[PDB]
Short mmCIF file of C-alpha atoms in Angstrom, two decimals:
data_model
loop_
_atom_site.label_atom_id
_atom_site.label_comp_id
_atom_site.label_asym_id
_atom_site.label_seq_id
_atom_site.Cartn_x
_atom_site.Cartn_y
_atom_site.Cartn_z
CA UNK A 1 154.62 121.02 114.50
CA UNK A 2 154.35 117.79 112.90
CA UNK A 3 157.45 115.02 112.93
CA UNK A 4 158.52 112.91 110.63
CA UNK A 5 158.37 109.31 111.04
CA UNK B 1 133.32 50.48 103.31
CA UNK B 2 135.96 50.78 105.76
CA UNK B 3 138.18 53.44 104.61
CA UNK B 4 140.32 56.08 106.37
CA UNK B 5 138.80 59.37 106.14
CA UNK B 6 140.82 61.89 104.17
CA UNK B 7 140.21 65.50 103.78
CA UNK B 8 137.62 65.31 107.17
CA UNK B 9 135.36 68.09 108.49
CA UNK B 10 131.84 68.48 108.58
CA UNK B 11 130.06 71.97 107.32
CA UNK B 12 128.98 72.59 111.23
CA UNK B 13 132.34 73.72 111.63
CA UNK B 14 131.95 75.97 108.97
CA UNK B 15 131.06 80.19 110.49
CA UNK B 16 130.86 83.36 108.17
CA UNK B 17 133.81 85.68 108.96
CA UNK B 18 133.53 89.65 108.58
CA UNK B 19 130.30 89.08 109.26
CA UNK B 20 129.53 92.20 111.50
CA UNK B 21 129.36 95.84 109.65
CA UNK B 22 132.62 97.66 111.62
CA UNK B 23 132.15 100.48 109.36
CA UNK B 24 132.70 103.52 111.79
CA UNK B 25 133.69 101.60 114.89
CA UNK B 26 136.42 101.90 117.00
CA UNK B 27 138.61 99.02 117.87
CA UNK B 28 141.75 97.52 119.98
CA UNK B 29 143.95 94.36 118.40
CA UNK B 30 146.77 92.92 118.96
CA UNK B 31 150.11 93.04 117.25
CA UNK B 32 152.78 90.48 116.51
CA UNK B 33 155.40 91.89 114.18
CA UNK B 34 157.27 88.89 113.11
CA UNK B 35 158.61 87.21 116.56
CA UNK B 36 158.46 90.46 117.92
CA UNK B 37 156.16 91.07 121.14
CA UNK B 38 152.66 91.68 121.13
CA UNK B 39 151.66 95.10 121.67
CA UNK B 40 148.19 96.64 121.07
CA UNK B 41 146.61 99.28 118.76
CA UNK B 42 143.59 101.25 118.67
CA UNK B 43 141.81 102.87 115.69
CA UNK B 44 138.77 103.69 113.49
CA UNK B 45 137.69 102.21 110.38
CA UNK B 46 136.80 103.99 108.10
CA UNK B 47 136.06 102.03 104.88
CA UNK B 48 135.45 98.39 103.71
CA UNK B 49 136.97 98.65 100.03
CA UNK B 50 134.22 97.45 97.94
CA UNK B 51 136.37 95.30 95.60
CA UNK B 52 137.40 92.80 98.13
CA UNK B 53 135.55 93.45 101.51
CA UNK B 54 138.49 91.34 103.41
CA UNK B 55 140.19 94.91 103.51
CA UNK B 56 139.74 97.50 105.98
CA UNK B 57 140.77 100.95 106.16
CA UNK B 58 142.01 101.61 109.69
CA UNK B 59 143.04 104.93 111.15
CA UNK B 60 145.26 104.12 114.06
CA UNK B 61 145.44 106.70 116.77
CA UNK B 62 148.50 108.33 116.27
CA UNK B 63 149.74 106.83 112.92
CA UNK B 64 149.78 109.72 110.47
CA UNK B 65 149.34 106.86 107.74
CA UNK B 66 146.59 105.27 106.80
CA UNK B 67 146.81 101.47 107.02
CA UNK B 68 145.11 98.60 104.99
CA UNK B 69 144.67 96.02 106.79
CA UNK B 70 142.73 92.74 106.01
CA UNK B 71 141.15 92.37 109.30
CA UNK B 72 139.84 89.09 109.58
CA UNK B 73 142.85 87.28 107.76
CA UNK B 74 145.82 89.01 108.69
CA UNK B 75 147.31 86.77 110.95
CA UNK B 76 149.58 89.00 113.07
CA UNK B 77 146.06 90.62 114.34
CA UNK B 78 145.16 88.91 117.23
CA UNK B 79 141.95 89.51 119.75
CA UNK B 80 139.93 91.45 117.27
CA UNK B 81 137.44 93.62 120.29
CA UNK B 82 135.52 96.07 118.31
CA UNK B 83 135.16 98.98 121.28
CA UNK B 84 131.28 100.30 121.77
CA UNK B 85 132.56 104.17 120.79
CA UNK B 86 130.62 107.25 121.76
CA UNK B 87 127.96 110.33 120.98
CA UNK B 88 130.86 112.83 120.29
CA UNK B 89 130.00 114.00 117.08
CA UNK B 90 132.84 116.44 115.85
CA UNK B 91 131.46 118.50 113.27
CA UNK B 92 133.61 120.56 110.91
CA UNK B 93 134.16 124.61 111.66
CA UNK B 94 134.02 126.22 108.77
CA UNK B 95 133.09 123.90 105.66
CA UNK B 96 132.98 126.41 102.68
CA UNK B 97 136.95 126.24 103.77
CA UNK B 98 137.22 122.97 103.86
CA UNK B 99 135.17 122.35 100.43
CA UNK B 100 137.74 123.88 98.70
CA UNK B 101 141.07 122.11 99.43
CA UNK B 102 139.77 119.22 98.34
CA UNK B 103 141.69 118.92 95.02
CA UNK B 104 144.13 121.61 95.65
CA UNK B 105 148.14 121.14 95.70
CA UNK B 106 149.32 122.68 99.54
CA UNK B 107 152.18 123.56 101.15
CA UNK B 108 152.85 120.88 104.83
CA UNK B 109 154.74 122.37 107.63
CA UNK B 110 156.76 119.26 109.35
CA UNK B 111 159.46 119.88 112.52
CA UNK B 112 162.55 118.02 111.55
CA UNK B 113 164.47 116.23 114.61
CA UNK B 114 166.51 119.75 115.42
CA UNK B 115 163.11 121.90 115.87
CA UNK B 116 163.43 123.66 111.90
CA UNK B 117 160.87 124.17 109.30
CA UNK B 118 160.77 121.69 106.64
CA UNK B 119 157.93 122.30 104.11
CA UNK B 120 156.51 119.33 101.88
CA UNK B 121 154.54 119.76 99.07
CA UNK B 122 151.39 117.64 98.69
CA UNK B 123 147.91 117.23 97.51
CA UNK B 124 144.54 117.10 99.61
CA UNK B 125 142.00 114.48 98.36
CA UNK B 126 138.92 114.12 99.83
CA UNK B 127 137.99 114.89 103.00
CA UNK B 128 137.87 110.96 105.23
CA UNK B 129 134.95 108.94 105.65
CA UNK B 130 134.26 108.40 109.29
CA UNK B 131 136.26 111.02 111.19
CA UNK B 132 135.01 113.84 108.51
CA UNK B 133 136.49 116.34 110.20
CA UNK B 134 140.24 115.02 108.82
CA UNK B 135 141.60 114.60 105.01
CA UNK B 136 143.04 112.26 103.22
CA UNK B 137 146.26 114.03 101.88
CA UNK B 138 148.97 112.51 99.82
CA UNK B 139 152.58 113.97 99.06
CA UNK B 140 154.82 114.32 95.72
CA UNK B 141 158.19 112.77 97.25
CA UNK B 142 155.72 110.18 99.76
CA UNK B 143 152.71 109.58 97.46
CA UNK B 144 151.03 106.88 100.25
CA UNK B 145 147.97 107.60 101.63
CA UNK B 146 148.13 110.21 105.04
CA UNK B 147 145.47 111.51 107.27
CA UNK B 148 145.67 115.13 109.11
CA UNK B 149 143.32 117.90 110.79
CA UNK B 150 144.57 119.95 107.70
CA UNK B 151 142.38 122.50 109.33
CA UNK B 152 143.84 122.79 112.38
CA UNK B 153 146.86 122.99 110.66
CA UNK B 154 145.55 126.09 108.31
CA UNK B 155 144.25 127.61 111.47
CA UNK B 156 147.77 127.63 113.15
CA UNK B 157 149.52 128.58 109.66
CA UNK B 158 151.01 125.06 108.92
CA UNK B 159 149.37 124.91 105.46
CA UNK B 160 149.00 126.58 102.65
CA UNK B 161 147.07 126.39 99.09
CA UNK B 162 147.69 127.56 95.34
CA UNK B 163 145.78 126.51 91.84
CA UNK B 164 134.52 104.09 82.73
CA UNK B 165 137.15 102.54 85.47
CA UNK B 166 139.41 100.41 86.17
CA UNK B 167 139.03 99.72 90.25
CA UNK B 168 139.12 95.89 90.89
CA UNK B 169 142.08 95.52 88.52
CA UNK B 170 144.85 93.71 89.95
CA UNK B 171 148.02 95.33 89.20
CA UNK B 172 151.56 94.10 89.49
CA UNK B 173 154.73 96.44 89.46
CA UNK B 174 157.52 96.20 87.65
CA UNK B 175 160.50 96.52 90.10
CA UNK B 176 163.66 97.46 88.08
CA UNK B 177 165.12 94.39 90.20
CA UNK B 178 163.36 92.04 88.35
CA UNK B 179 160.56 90.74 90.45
CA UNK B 180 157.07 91.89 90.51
CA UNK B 181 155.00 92.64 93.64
CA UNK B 182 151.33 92.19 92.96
CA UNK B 183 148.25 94.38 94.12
CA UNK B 184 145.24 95.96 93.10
CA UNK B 185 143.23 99.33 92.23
CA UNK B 186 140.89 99.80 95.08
CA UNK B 187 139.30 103.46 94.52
CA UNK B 188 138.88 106.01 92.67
CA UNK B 189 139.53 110.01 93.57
CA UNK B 190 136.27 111.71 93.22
CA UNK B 191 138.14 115.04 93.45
CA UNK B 192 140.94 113.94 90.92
CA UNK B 193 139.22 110.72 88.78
CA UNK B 194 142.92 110.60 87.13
CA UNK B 195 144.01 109.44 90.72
CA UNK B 196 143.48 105.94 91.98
CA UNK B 197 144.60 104.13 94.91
CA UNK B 198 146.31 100.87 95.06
CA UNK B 199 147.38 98.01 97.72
CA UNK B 200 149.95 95.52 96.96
CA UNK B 201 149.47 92.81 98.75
CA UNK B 202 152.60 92.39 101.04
CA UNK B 203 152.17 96.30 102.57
CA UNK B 204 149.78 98.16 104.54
CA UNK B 205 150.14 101.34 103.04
CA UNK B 206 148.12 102.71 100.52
CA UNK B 207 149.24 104.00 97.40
CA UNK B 208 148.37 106.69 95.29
CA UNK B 209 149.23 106.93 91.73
CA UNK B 210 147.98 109.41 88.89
CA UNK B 211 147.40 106.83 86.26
CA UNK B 212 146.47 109.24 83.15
#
């Protein structure tokens, strides 16, 4: 559940 | 003689800076990105780079990258309080785990903007130096330096695993559009001692580049 910048 | 003075000061005038150890400490600064307004950060040190002790290693709370940052220097850092930070040890769950990813090439579960599952290939390299319960982690196709809970993310199945020196050298690179930008090695990988990290000096980010 990490975004990318 | 009655001269005008010149190149006047006097060595009162004349204080240590970085004097304080902020090793470990927690701290708030302010911002000024170009004429842009001045908004303020929080973070953790976690290193003073042995090769030139102007430059810290900052985690800041909720950047996923690690930044360089020469603390005392940089002149967009403003109002430098270092934050008295607390007896909350974190300790690591389960450490056998954790002992071995260092070194190994994993698998990085990211959202993209829609909600779907992008996966990014990387590499885990040490566990980090203050907040030891997070890893430094770099990635093939965005080889700068990253910090993440990469257990946590095991835990939750957002990761998976398979199977003298040269650190002071300043570097330049050779930019296929002619000019050069100039930097240096700062460390060495323990994990992988072919890896080494650099910082150029007009960037924040560090780099990590397999140099054998």
């Amino acid at each position: 559940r990490h975004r990318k910048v | 003689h009655h001269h005008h003075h010149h190149h006047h000061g006097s060595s009162e005038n004349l204080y240590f800076q970085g004097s304080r150890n902020i090793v470990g400490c927690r701290i708030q600064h302010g911002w000024k990105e170009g004429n842009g307004p001045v908004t303020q950060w929080k973070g953790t040190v976690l290193d003073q780079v042995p090769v030139n002790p102007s430059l810290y290693l900052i985690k800041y709370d909720g950047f996923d990258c690690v930044y360089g940052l020469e603390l005392n220097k940089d002149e967009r850092v403003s109002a430098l309080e270092v934050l008295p930070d607390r007896v909350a040890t974190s300790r690591i769950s389960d450490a056998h785990l954790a002992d071995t990813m260092i070194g190994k090439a994993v698998e990085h579960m990211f959202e993209t903007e829609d909600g779907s599952k992008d996966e990014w290939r990387g590499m885990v390299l040490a566990r980090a130096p203050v907040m030891n319960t997070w890893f430094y982690i770099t990635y093939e196709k965005d080889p700068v330096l990253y910090m993440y809970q990469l257990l946590d993310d095991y835990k939750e199945g957002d990761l998976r695993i398979m199977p003298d020196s040269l650190v002071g050298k300043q570097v330049e690179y050779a930019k296929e559009d002619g000019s050069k930008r100039t930097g240096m090695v700062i460390h060495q990988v323990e994990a992988k001692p072919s890896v080494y990290f650099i910082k150029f000096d007009d960037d924040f980010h560090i780099y990590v580049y397999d140099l054998v």
